[PDB]
Amino acid sequence: AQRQFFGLTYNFYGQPAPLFDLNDLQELAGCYARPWTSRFSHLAISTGSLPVWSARYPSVASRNIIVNTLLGAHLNPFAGGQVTSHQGITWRDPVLSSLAPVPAIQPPPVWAVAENVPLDSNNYPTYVLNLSSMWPINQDVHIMTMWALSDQGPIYHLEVPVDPMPAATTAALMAYIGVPIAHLAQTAYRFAGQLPQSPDSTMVSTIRWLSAIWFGSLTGRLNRSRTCNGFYFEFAKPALNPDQAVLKWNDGARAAPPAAAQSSYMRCISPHWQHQIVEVAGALMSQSVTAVTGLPALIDEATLPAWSQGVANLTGNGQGVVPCLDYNPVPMAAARHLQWRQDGLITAAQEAQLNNDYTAYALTIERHLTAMLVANPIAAGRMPIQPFNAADFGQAGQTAAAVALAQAMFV
Amino acid sequence: AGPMTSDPHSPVKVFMALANLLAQPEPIAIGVPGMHQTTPASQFSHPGVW
Amino acid sequence: PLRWPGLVDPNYRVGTNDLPNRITLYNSLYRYNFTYPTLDGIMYVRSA
């Protein structure tokens, strides 16, 4: 298994306290139930089936964001070795099974508020001694950290080995053909979440490949013309709703393995991710792999927010550092369409039309989000959506480098 | 009767058949994740599980 | 028209709604064709 993890709590965007009200906690972690594997309990195949368009939690990412903020107020044992209370609520037991209002006879100490708190598993010995039951904490803390480390989109990791796929993964994928991305992401989250597993497990390699294939198809390098061992992802028409992808297997030409093992970190540079299910699912799915296997290497600090500079066990600028790339969906879509034309899947006339459709679609997402922010100003004390500026929708980021990586990743 | 058939996997199947019978006296490591020396030999019916 | 955005609204986008506040009667949805193989339909069931 993996007997240790490191983490980092969220950042207050100038506000003095963590951003969530009692109702958020009461609804998102109430009923005295275990909160430790709930991230997919409020997701589905598509936005149309979800109440993400209005009222509280008016975004795809909204619920998971608040969850992360909520956890930041109660992860003190991995920072100071002691359970605490915040606004009258604390854990029921040293195992951190669930939350409850504080007892009246012997209340625990009140938590002193702080932000961007580094976390070590070793600070709380009982965790390791009860690893078999406290395992789910590992995954969620990792997820929270991977999101907390970045503004705009969360960070996740990619890698491709020099070897071909093992047979076991091939058979597993051959049973996941018609599945949409969201369902796939759930299984990955469900797998790593509920009991310890060793990194040398078939599922671990399986999900690792999925993240690779998803990105390769996202960049358009993997298509009906060119596929990874026969697999690739298919994206919905931009004319109706491009926020959907399904797995496919095909008799097209198979891409050759890279000359050397490739790996990097990724994130979305633009606010569109907050209301785009494929981004959320892809990030969560990829993060699940790193959760069970740990971080392969320190993340490059060069292009990260100020609070992310030089975080112990997480970020670095030395030799043993993996760079992190980022992209904007709109330029990415244009690149994907261009690759399709060069592969001959479409004509030039179609490519122009696809760009117009996707840009129109993205504009709606931006228009919705920007209107939603002023509806929920962060000064209100809870953050349903991460703050941003209008110019953030126009950043091209490192998109050119990103497609270059896929170029080298699937030769 | 091995070489008479046309199945490309026939050589491997022939090999594993003996391997099954010798699991106790001559145990070896089959370097294929998801398979064991006691897996029924007839099921080794694919490349990559060789 | 408010209850039929996906039928008369020129600016309707697939995958939207106002569920917590209002109910729309005409929408877009998915349908499936799952099969339910038995255990023996998954693997070689015999002695191993």
From Swiss-Prot, chain A:
**Which InterPro entries would you find in this protein's record?**
Sigma_1_2_reovir
Keywords from the UniProt entry: Capsid protein, Intermediate capsid protein, Virion
- UniProt superkingdom: Viruses
Q: Which Gene3D superfamilies match?
A: 1.10.287.1520
| Residues making up the signal peptide according to the UniProt record | none
Q: Which cellular components does GO assign to this protein?
A: viral intermediate capsid
Q: Does the keyword Ribosomal protein apply?
A: no
Q: Where in the cell is it found?
A: Virion
Q: Does the keyword Signal apply?
A: no
Its annotated function is as follows: Located at the interface of the incomplete T=13 outer capsid and the pseudo T=2 inner capsid, 120 VP6 subunits clamp and stabilizes the inner capsid shell.
Quaternary structure and partners: Interacts with capsid proteins VP3, VP5 and VP7.
Similarity section:
Belongs to the reoviridae clamp protein family.
What's the protein here called? Clamp protein VP6
Q: Which organism is it from?
A: Aquareovirus C (isolate Golden shiner/USA/GSRV/1977)
Swiss-Prot record, chain C:
As for subcellular location, the record says: Virion
* Signal peptide positions on this chain: none
Bridged cysteine pairs (disulfide)? none
Instruction: Relate the protein's function as given in its record.
Output: Inner capsid protein that self-assembles to form an icosahedral capsid with a T=2 symmetry, which consists of 120 copies of VP2, with channels at each of its five-fold vertices. This capsid constitutes the innermost concentric layer of the viral mature particle.
What assembly does the database describe for this protein? Homodecamer; each decamer is made up of two conformers of VP2, called VP2A and VP2B. 12 homodecamers assemble to form an icosahedral capsid. Interacts with VP6.
Name the family the entry cites.
Belongs to the turreted BTV-fold inner capsid family.
Name used for this protein in its record: Inner capsid protein VP3
Q: Which organism is it from?
A: Aquareovirus C (isolate Golden shiner/USA/GSRV/1977)
- First and last residue shown, out of the full length, are 1166 to 1213 of 1214
